[PDB]
């Protein structure tokens, strides 16, 4: 029941802005949607504003607002994400694609008025030109995984590590090992959690009337483990 959680009681507009550079291939993505944390529900549409996306859309799902997670009543003292609002938090990750390159991301998630904004910078290096990522060999599928969270008292925040498996067009899998760290932007108290995890269901689709390179995403996220 942090003060920040009070800002998520209803439907909240979401805005996402990302600038990326993977092996020198630069691109930008904008996203808009709404989140209803009471139900851990998110509906968003992302657009590559610079032309064709140089990496597969599924590889950007985790990067492109865990503050919308539905925390059970008995676990609300463990919701770091909402507690950091409205000032927000910095979310950083290193994502290692097995036998390929890695993404390093830094984002600031905070409220700008009634809108929850996620601004991100993504840098990818060491990718293979004809690999599964730059070669666009990943299926446009359902990302269903867990995120294991632990407190990071030293940084007044949290850390998390988890695996994302992306189906490859040949039936195989491209592993993406995620390492995450979140720290509050403000100086007020936040909720440092006991170990737990977030279970997210992500469905990817296309807007039949959209000609720009894009991704429509429907997600449901719920905290558990305690």
GROMACS .gro file of C-alpha atoms in nm:
model
  226
    1UNK     CA    1   0.000   0.000   0.000
    2UNK     CA    2   0.277   0.243  -0.091
    3UNK     CA    3   0.179   0.593  -0.199
    4UNK     CA    4   0.300   0.498  -0.545
    5UNK     CA    5   0.056   0.208  -0.566
    6UNK     CA    6  -0.232   0.454  -0.532
    7UNK     CA    7  -0.140   0.586  -0.878
    8UNK     CA    8  -0.228   0.249  -1.036
    9UNK     CA    9  -0.582   0.194  -0.904
   10UNK     CA   10  -0.742   0.250  -1.245
   11UNK     CA   11  -0.653   0.238  -1.616
   12UNK     CA   12  -0.327   0.421  -1.682
   13UNK     CA   13  -0.203   0.548  -2.020
   14UNK     CA   14   0.143   0.421  -2.114
   15UNK     CA   15   0.404   0.576  -2.342
   16UNK     CA   16   0.727   0.403  -2.444
   17UNK     CA   17   1.020   0.557  -2.633
   18UNK     CA   18   1.329   0.361  -2.730
   19UNK     CA   19   1.645   0.454  -2.915
   20UNK     CA   20   1.854   0.157  -3.019
   21UNK     CA   21   2.180   0.070  -3.188
   22UNK     CA   22   2.263  -0.296  -3.257
   23UNK     CA   23   2.595  -0.354  -3.435
   24UNK     CA   24   2.564   0.000  -3.569
   25UNK     CA   25   2.211  -0.053  -3.702
   26UNK     CA   26   2.025   0.239  -3.545
   27UNK     CA   27   1.651   0.253  -3.492
   28UNK     CA   28   1.380   0.402  -3.276
   29UNK     CA   29   1.056   0.260  -3.143
   30UNK     CA   30   0.755   0.436  -2.996
   31UNK     CA   31   0.477   0.263  -2.808
   32UNK     CA   32   0.140   0.351  -2.663
   33UNK     CA   33  -0.119   0.167  -2.464
   34UNK     CA   34  -0.284   0.128  -2.128
   35UNK     CA   35  -0.225  -0.071  -1.813
   36UNK     CA   36  -0.471  -0.185  -1.546
   37UNK     CA   37  -0.251  -0.313  -1.262
   38UNK     CA   38  -0.544  -0.434  -1.055
   39UNK     CA   39  -0.571  -0.709  -1.318
   40UNK     CA   40  -0.204  -0.707  -1.418
   41UNK     CA   41  -0.322  -0.622  -1.769
   42UNK     CA   42  -0.134  -0.437  -2.042
   43UNK     CA   43  -0.234  -0.357  -2.401
   44UNK     CA   44   0.023  -0.186  -2.621
   45UNK     CA   45   0.116  -0.114  -2.979
   46UNK     CA   46   0.475  -0.045  -3.080
   47UNK     CA   47   0.596   0.112  -3.402
   48UNK     CA   48   0.946   0.129  -3.549
   49UNK     CA   49   0.962   0.499  -3.638
   50UNK     CA   50   1.282   0.485  -3.840
   51UNK     CA   51   1.183   0.219  -4.094
   52UNK     CA   52   1.229  -0.157  -4.069
   53UNK     CA   53   1.331  -0.293  -3.730
   54UNK     CA   54   1.684  -0.443  -3.764
   55UNK     CA   55   1.620  -0.708  -3.496
   56UNK     CA   56   1.319  -0.934  -3.435
   57UNK     CA   57   1.033  -0.778  -3.244
   58UNK     CA   58   1.026  -1.063  -2.990
   59UNK     CA   59   1.377  -0.976  -2.877
   60UNK     CA   60   1.258  -0.632  -2.762
   61UNK     CA   61   0.955  -0.740  -2.560
   62UNK     CA   62   1.129  -0.751  -2.223
   63UNK     CA   63   1.294  -0.415  -2.286
   64UNK     CA   64   0.990  -0.222  -2.411
   65UNK     CA   65   0.680  -0.161  -1.713
   66UNK     CA   66   0.674  -0.413  -1.432
   67UNK     CA   67   0.496  -0.156  -1.220
   68UNK     CA   68   0.178  -0.293  -1.386
   69UNK     CA   69   0.219  -0.635  -1.224
   70UNK     CA   70  -0.072  -0.758  -1.017
   71UNK     CA   71   0.062  -0.816  -0.665
   72UNK     CA   72  -0.163  -1.030  -0.444
   73UNK     CA   73  -0.287  -0.852  -0.131
   74UNK     CA   74  -0.059  -1.064   0.088
   75UNK     CA   75   0.244  -0.959  -0.118
   76UNK     CA   76   0.187  -0.586  -0.158
   77UNK     CA   77   0.471  -0.498   0.082
   78UNK     CA   78   0.700  -0.652  -0.182
   79UNK     CA   79   0.604  -0.435  -0.479
   80UNK     CA   80   0.917  -0.227  -0.534
   81UNK     CA   81   0.806  -0.101  -0.876
   82UNK     CA   82   0.498   0.093  -0.773
   83UNK     CA   83   0.661   0.213  -0.449
   84UNK     CA   84   0.922   0.402  -0.651
   85UNK     CA   85   0.649   0.606  -0.825
   86UNK     CA   86   0.589   0.882  -0.918
   87UNK     CA   87   0.960   0.971  -0.918
   88UNK     CA   88   1.030   0.640  -1.085
   89UNK     CA   89   1.310   0.394  -1.123
   90UNK     CA   90   1.600   0.318  -1.351
   91UNK     CA   91   1.587  -0.031  -1.502
   92UNK     CA   92   1.908  -0.169  -1.646
   93UNK     CA   93   1.969  -0.500  -1.816
   94UNK     CA   94   2.230  -0.702  -1.994
   95UNK     CA   95   2.076  -0.966  -2.220
   96UNK     CA   96   2.311  -1.237  -2.349
   97UNK     CA   97   2.191  -1.413  -2.665
   98UNK     CA   98   2.350  -1.756  -2.658
   99UNK     CA   99   2.612  -1.793  -2.931
  100UNK     CA  100   2.541  -1.438  -3.046
  101UNK     CA  101   2.563  -1.079  -2.922
  102UNK     CA  102   2.425  -0.898  -2.622
  103UNK     CA  103   2.195  -0.607  -2.551
  104UNK     CA  104   2.261  -0.356  -2.275
  105UNK     CA  105   1.964  -0.142  -2.186
  106UNK     CA  106   1.902   0.152  -1.955
  107UNK     CA  107   1.553   0.284  -1.901
  108UNK     CA  108   1.383   0.535  -1.679
  109UNK     CA  109   1.023   0.454  -1.587
  110UNK     CA  110   0.828   0.734  -1.424
  111UNK     CA  111   0.504   0.928  -1.439
  112UNK     CA  112   0.470   1.238  -1.653
  113UNK     CA  113   0.133   1.353  -1.529
  114UNK     CA  114  -0.121   1.072  -1.571
  115UNK     CA  115   0.100   0.891  -1.821
  116UNK     CA  116   0.342   0.617  -1.719
  117UNK     CA  117   0.649   0.668  -1.939
  118UNK     CA  118   0.926   0.420  -2.020
  119UNK     CA  119   1.225   0.585  -2.194
  120UNK     CA  120   1.496   0.345  -2.307
  121UNK     CA  121   1.840   0.341  -2.464
  122UNK     CA  122   1.947   0.003  -2.606
  123UNK     CA  123   2.295  -0.088  -2.726
  124UNK     CA  124   2.368  -0.422  -2.888
  125UNK     CA  125   2.712  -0.546  -2.986
  126UNK     CA  126   2.888  -0.859  -3.108
  127UNK     CA  127   2.598  -0.994  -3.311
  128UNK     CA  128   2.649  -1.222  -3.607
  129UNK     CA  129   2.537  -1.061  -3.934
  130UNK     CA  130   2.371  -1.386  -4.040
  131UNK     CA  131   2.266  -1.488  -3.691
  132UNK     CA  132   1.916  -1.546  -3.558
  133UNK     CA  133   1.883  -1.184  -3.452
  134UNK     CA  134   2.026  -0.973  -3.732
  135UNK     CA  135   1.913  -1.242  -3.976
  136UNK     CA  136   1.553  -1.229  -3.852
  137UNK     CA  137   1.519  -1.604  -3.796
  138UNK     CA  138   1.302  -1.587  -3.484
  139UNK     CA  139   0.933  -1.674  -3.484
  140UNK     CA  140   0.678  -1.405  -3.397
  141UNK     CA  141   0.551  -1.595  -3.093
  142UNK     CA  142   0.409  -1.597  -2.740
  143UNK     CA  143   0.666  -1.500  -2.476
  144UNK     CA  144   0.573  -1.683  -2.155
  145UNK     CA  145   0.825  -1.680  -1.869
  146UNK     CA  146   0.898  -1.588  -1.510
  147UNK     CA  147   1.116  -1.314  -1.363
  148UNK     CA  148   1.293  -1.400  -1.037
  149UNK     CA  149   1.335  -1.098  -0.814
  150UNK     CA  150   1.568  -1.040  -0.521
  151UNK     CA  151   1.634  -0.734  -0.306
  152UNK     CA  152   1.948  -0.528  -0.362
  153UNK     CA  153   1.973  -0.340  -0.031
  154UNK     CA  154   2.310  -0.187  -0.121
  155UNK     CA  155   2.144   0.002  -0.407
  156UNK     CA  156   1.807   0.050  -0.234
  157UNK     CA  157   1.656  -0.151  -0.516
  158UNK     CA  158   1.622  -0.495  -0.669
  159UNK     CA  159   1.790  -0.734  -0.907
  160UNK     CA  160   1.653  -1.013  -1.123
  161UNK     CA  161   1.781  -1.285  -1.352
  162UNK     CA  162   1.583  -1.504  -1.588
  163UNK     CA  163   1.590  -1.693  -1.914
  164UNK     CA  164   1.387  -1.609  -2.222
  165UNK     CA  165   1.373  -1.870  -2.497
  166UNK     CA  166   1.290  -1.749  -2.846
  167UNK     CA  167   1.167  -2.008  -3.096
  168UNK     CA  168   1.378  -2.016  -3.412
  169UNK     CA  169   1.215  -2.075  -3.753
  170UNK     CA  170   1.373  -2.420  -3.773
  171UNK     CA  171   1.215  -2.547  -3.454
  172UNK     CA  172   1.517  -2.478  -3.236
  173UNK     CA  173   1.555  -2.216  -2.962
  174UNK     CA  174   1.756  -1.898  -2.917
  175UNK     CA  175   1.828  -1.843  -2.550
  176UNK     CA  176   1.840  -1.487  -2.412
  177UNK     CA  177   1.981  -1.479  -2.058
  178UNK     CA  178   1.855  -1.170  -1.877
  179UNK     CA  179   2.029  -0.987  -1.592
  180UNK     CA  180   1.843  -0.695  -1.441
  181UNK     CA  181   1.891  -0.422  -1.181
  182UNK     CA  182   1.643  -0.154  -1.073
  183UNK     CA  183   1.713   0.147  -0.854
  184UNK     CA  184   1.483   0.430  -0.743
  185UNK     CA  185   1.521   0.774  -0.897
  186UNK     CA  186   1.375   0.951  -0.592
  187UNK     CA  187   1.514   0.960  -0.238
  188UNK     CA  188   1.196   0.847  -0.062
  189UNK     CA  189   1.152   0.503   0.097
  190UNK     CA  190   1.074   0.213  -0.133
  191UNK     CA  191   0.961  -0.143  -0.071
  192UNK     CA  192   1.254  -0.387  -0.080
  193UNK     CA  193   1.107  -0.734  -0.144
  194UNK     CA  194   1.166  -1.081  -0.015
  195UNK     CA  195   1.243  -1.324  -0.298
  196UNK     CA  196   0.951  -1.380  -0.536
  197UNK     CA  197   0.875  -1.388  -0.906
  198UNK     CA  198   0.657  -1.230  -1.172
  199UNK     CA  199   0.469  -1.458  -1.407
  200UNK     CA  200   0.398  -1.290  -1.742
  201UNK     CA  201   0.187  -1.403  -2.037
  202UNK     CA  202   0.273  -1.212  -2.357
  203UNK     CA  203   0.075  -1.244  -2.682
  204UNK     CA  204   0.213  -1.084  -2.998
  205UNK     CA  205  -0.003  -0.985  -3.293
  206UNK     CA  206  -0.033  -0.746  -3.586
  207UNK     CA  207  -0.269  -0.456  -3.659
  208UNK     CA  208  -0.432  -0.549  -3.993
  209UNK     CA  209  -0.451  -0.183  -4.097
  210UNK     CA  210  -0.095  -0.091  -3.999
  211UNK     CA  211   0.167  -0.070  -4.275
  212UNK     CA  212   0.459   0.045  -4.058
  213UNK     CA  213   0.678  -0.222  -3.896
  214UNK     CA  214   0.502  -0.277  -3.563
  215UNK     CA  215   0.402  -0.510  -3.281
  216UNK     CA  216   0.076  -0.534  -3.087
  217UNK     CA  217   0.118  -0.682  -2.741
  218UNK     CA  218  -0.133  -0.810  -2.487
  219UNK     CA  219   0.020  -0.903  -2.152
  220UNK     CA  220  -0.094  -1.026  -1.812
  221UNK     CA  221   0.151  -1.022  -1.522
  222UNK     CA  222   0.107  -1.152  -1.169
  223UNK     CA  223   0.344  -1.169  -0.872
  224UNK     CA  224   0.375  -1.500  -0.686
  225UNK     CA  225   0.614  -1.714  -0.484
  226UNK     CA  226   0.516  -1.602  -0.134
   0.00000   0.00000   0.00000
